[PDB]
């Protein structure tokens, strides 16, 4: 699993 | 799984 | 597992 | 980018 | 980027 | 890069 918080 | 939260 | 917190 | 070759 | 050759 | 050879 990926991912991005931004 | 992928996910980009922006 | 990946994750960025940004 | 991602690949398997099997 | 992720590769697999099997 | 990740590369698996098998």
């Not at 699993?1 to 931004?6: P, S």
């Given at each position: 699993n990926?991912?991005?918080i931004i």
């Amino acid at each position: 699993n990926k991912g991005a918080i931004i």
